[PDB]
Amino acid sequence: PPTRLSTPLYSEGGAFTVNWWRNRYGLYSRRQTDPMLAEFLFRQQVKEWFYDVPSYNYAALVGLALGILVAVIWRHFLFNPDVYVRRQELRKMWPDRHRQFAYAVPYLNPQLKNLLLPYKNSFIDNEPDYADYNPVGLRPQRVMAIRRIPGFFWAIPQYFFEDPLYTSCSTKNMQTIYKKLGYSEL
């Protein structure tokens, strides 16, 4: 950051640069009344906000948050079966809304849902696979994960083959025990 007004500031070309910022910073300013004073105040602001290393961390956080936000909005409008912007289907009774029903199953099976559901065994001790089997076919059949969720799950062993009681707590062994008593089907 130069300390002499004689030494120019480098600027890239584009819509967010040092030159672009100079043109607009003093539009509403009553304090930038002459070139010398205007440049001094401009460089003062640039030095304080753009040459501050920690400030760039917040720039990353706003971008990430806003990107997620714009995308979740767009996704609802574009794919959610229950969001209507066109009216053709809204001018018909429910049984006749075939074009809107086409969004239903694809929207019911997002990638992350398929990728993360197998990791329920890191949150449930007894019968973590109680809801895995479903004969209908709207969703995929679920297989329990082989490893704990990465991160703060130190209470469970890193891999479930290491756990001694894991197999005896499965919905299959529990079904065997209860079926031997005639207690229940599941």
């Binding site: 304080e48 906000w49 501050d52 920690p54 400030s55 961390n57 917040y58 956080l61 706003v62 948050a65 936000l69």
Partner: peptide
Amino acid sequence: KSMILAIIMISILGSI
């Protein structure tokens, strides 16, 4: 500046 930018950030996030 991080204090100031933290306050601005909390506001934007708090609005959503």
